[PDB]
Amino acid sequence: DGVGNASGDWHCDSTWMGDRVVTKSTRTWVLPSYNNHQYREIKSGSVDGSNANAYFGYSTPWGYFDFNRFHSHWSPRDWQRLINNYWGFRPRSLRVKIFNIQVKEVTVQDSTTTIANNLTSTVQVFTDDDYQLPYVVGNGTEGCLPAFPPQVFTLPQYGYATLNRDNTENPTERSSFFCLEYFPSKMLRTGNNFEFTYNFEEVPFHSSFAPSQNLFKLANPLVDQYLYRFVSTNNTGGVQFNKNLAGRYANTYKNWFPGPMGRTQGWNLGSGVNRASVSAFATTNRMELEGASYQVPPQPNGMTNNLQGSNTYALENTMIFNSQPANPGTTATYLEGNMLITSESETQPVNRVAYNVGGQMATNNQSSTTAPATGTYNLQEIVPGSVWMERDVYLQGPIWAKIPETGAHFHPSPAMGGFGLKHPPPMMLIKNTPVPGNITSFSDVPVSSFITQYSTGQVTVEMEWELKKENSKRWNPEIQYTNNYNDPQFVDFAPDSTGEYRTTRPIGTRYLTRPL
């Protein structure tokens, strides 16, 4: 519309209406003119002693809007209301608006650097609706809408890795270059705005409850089974049997089995002792791909990284967040007191402990001359009649991930937790349209000098979430997430004396309980 007329209003709120909740989040963003308006082939050979760090790709002059983290939409109090009252939830729709665009021109005349807004300049915006570009959004990276509403953020630069040759920095003939200008996009001057709507595909509810029963003890403890078990052989070798008694869950016949597991080194936190001076990398779990070895945190779903009351943690099977955002590219050493370390203990009644053996199988054929032998295993995958709980989601964790397009997959549930989608919210890309400097003579060579500038504006994201009601008959009170602190010096989830947002703990989702 015009220079002196706002193109949108500030919407931040949450509205609960029975079985649905609508969250609205608005934030102020800033967008730098990355790579000075050009694409740059980027790459890397081995780094830190691993050719898995090798890659070939491109960086683009584009930035993107990422809102794939629960805290970008949920305030702590709203998150508490959710996890303390519902058995599950799931996203249904999404609406995004970008408005109140302002383009500023920066000039360093004799070192006084003045910032003046350029009224006739534009930004370009488009969404990759058909997923024709590498989808970098569901990979746990930085640059999402901030958790605290007043915080202004910088949009991350869009870049991607394509195929690299023989674990080197070189491309292959199958490496692909994607040109973002080769998509239609809207051009906005200061009076214009941009809007976009989307609907999520049908996905299962996240399970925000914890088993109030152990998978191996579903049988009635007051009744014996009508099934018997082999317990030994007489002095001759004639097999003998005993009836499985009531309560003897060690022997009861079972219908269902725990989820798959892959042993993951257990470490001790707080008041726990560990092997000193160890360098983690060499003994970490790995998976080989294209002739290289990669660490695969947090490991496939199916296990619990820690037992309730225990201080042992299968750290590679854990989601570990920082209690605050850190500078980019830092190599500083962090200790437990600076980290938000999550625990999947709610799942222990059905998910196997990650730092223990999964079980044992028979390793030979017994005979009059050979005693039966057994052997433990450190990994077991999916078997029929298997059941397990997916990783929990957290206020500071990711919401969804794109299921890779290959034509085949099994149980597309994202390892980092959340919702696996075939058609996730599309990439929303934006960039500052280049404005050429004083060019006075012709040349068939592409212009190189550009007036330096950056853009800023607001962004609103509104999401509707469907809720699954709690229909429990438990008589005694349940566990609830509570604001429990002792002799506080500050309020958690609030700005400090300097205005920095403080969050001392990760908030999961499983407080309510349900029997199996």
Next chain:
Amino acid sequence: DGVGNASGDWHCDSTWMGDRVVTKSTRTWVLPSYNNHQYREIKSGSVDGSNANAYFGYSTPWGYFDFNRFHSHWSPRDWQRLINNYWGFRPRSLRVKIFNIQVKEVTVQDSTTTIANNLTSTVQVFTDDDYQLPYVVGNGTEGCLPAFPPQVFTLPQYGYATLNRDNTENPTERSSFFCLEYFPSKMLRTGNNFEFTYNFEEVPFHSSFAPSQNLFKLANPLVDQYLYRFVSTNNTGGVQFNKNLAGRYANTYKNWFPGPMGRTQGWNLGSGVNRASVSAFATTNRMELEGASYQVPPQPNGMTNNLQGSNTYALENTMIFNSQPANPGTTATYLEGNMLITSESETQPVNRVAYNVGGQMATNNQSSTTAPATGTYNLQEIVPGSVWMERDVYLQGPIWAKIPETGAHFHPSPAMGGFGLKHPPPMMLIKNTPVPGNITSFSDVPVSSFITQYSTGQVTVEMEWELKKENSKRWNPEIQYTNNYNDPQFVDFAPDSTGEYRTTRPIGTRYLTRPL
């Protein structure tokens, strides 16, 4: 209709119409009177040092029409048009016609053997629509419609193995005998024809594209993750963490995992060195069934048998064709220069290398007195969040396979590649109706002398295929299958000076690329 009137015309063609393509193939066939009009119990004990070669079954006087190979329908040029332009395809319908039947009577009078056509003789034809007979068609056997249209072929004899006892040649009380005359069938004299139509069940498109991205490096290489990792313990044992940086794909948290794998010995081709004088059989991968050991080429889907640029091949995880048809029952030794050896390298960005370890797990519990230990594994099956590409299909490979009827299975994708069907094109059986010789006296004993004869005619198969369009935004050119030869002495996919059809290479399907 009549003796002097043709009962069908020659249809060989292909018609492309947007999202569909219709292929038509006609061929001349010849049918011998197998087993001289009788069923013969067939069997075998151990052979070549393996009781897995033992079997019990029957051979029948029937022949069958098999057209379960891509080249029976696709000409090389049409195959090239397909693989260079589409992201996938799948069969939709099938129509078969058998016509222009001619029955010839052979007589060896004093060794002059004259061939005269018997106008009053018939052939019988029927299709096993309800799958009540052993389905032998999707098992990589010979006798399919020839790839080159002018070639006349012999119909293979129908036979099957039922249950054999304790890996011997003896039957069991559960062994079943199937009598093909116990089905209704059409009888055709020289003026008659036979027609049949069929529709394929809904099946997924074959993926005829290659990942242009590595499964473990989907993250944006310009942005760090907001997740941290355990990297070591201080001189006391207090765990320490580091932020996962941009591009360090060796450490990035991952959402998805590669497909399942089972280590398969890697061998070298061409300019590669191998252990000399080895006898393959003993160290080949195996699976036990009913007290016996079987080789299971080409292994379950999920792996790549070779890396791009590498000359190493997990030969037991490879589809190996001959560059021409060989005589039946040959035991000649073949070298690489006579074989069409396929490579699944297009899948390397998501399928694990078959001749390498899959990865490593933790093998103990670390402690102040014990350093953490890890151990590699040679096989890992399906885990949640797993993704992979099925084996590719080839111009000379099979199209479909029947899913065994057992009431339980997982991801029915045929190991040899193609489409797994519950109700595949039915067996189309045909045989020469017996004509008794000069019988002059009665006997309650079944007649044994029969006028010797064989039949010949044409067969047409028409298939409609649905195509999935390529919707790519890749800027730079893609790889395409091309007729690239240097200083040729002959044209590949053409008859030679003697008329024999020459095919020097296997043509896969994955040339186009798509990001993940």
Next chain:
Amino acid sequence: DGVGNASGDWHCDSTWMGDRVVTKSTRTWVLPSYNNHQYREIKSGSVDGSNANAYFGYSTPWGYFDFNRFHSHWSPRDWQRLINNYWGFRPRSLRVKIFNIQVKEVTVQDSTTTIANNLTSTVQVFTDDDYQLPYVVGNGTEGCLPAFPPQVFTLPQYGYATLNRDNTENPTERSSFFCLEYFPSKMLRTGNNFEFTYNFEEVPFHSSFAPSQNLFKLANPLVDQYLYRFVSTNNTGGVQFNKNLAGRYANTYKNWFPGPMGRTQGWNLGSGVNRASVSAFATTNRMELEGASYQVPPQPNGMTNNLQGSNTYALENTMIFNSQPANPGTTATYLEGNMLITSESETQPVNRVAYNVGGQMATNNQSSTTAPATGTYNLQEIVPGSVWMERDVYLQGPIWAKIPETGAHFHPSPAMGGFGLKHPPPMMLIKNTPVPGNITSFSDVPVSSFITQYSTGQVTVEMEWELKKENSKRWNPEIQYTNNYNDPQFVDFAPDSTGEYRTTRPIGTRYLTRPL
């Protein structure tokens, strides 16, 4: 409309719809105020030892939009899709939009030079619909829309040569001066835009296929002709004849002849030896006009500048591009490794080799006392029953050329390749409207001082192309353009580490084959 409202969006895309394809290209342009708002008579005498370099003309303060190069509309991948699947194509319509205009005023106050946009300034635009101005667009000059979308370009200055006297720098009484202000034009301020539509006249499809047969061997090689030939005279002089046999293509009677030819010196590239220290100019092909000698590359259509597999090139009958844009007016020496040298070998089955003799004629009257004599010719023009292929078009080559208006011409097919048009896309001219500086006193003398400024904006061009489908019955696979590189260090047709667009090869159009 207004200052803070965009007047157009970014459209870059391609849409294939059966027999048509629509390409859209948008680019950012910059326009200098050429000649400081005035016309300048320009001229030149002899230069480099040639009075053909003499000319008389004018330079104007106008710039023009040129999009007469295939790569301005086709991306490499789209070009590959075109040439690998169609037998021909042709342009049908064109739509152009100029928008998001920004006019900047430059001021050098004490050497700090500030750039500020002048909101009340205009640019003027008009198209020469009636072709009343010299048409400079179809002459292989620089300044066309860039091949790579993100590249910003400078608009070339409009100028033309009229008639010069006796190969000197002087005008003639017939020399004409054209004043561009003497045309109606639109004036646009920052909120305005300009649009224009055009339809191409009916033109033949470009032939994007290659003959799979030799023009002189169309006869059936298994059958003799019923025509005979004179082969000699007996010892007396009585003529003798022989029947033309099957396959003897050297003697067969022919119905059709190759295209016209004019011998062009052949040079060797790569591993080929050439006469050293030669200065090309003196022995180059020429044509005389108005008392002067001109080089006429790439020579009239009808010949092939090179044979398949041969390293010899009739360089003056070749289109030679640079693998990147070079500065204006450069006199640097370029070697083969920096050039994109094209080859017309696809046409060799019908176009005569340019560096060979065309053939030979009889040069005398034989007699009992004089043996028959023959003589080779170095040039032969059009004869009845002549057939040939026009020059191929290239991704980096021109699309069309204006047919000179003289009232007479033959086969208006542009030597540089492309489409010869009588009414081609009109010249689209634009310039910065002059803004006078501080003038304080009257004078009948035309104002000379002007506020210095330049303009910038976007330009979109959309073209619809009609396609001719490939209807081939060739059995074996065809040749296809493919992204085939060995051990690449960079991706061709992609920006390098510095962002510069790299194109290492010229892509022609003739990959598919058709018989004659």
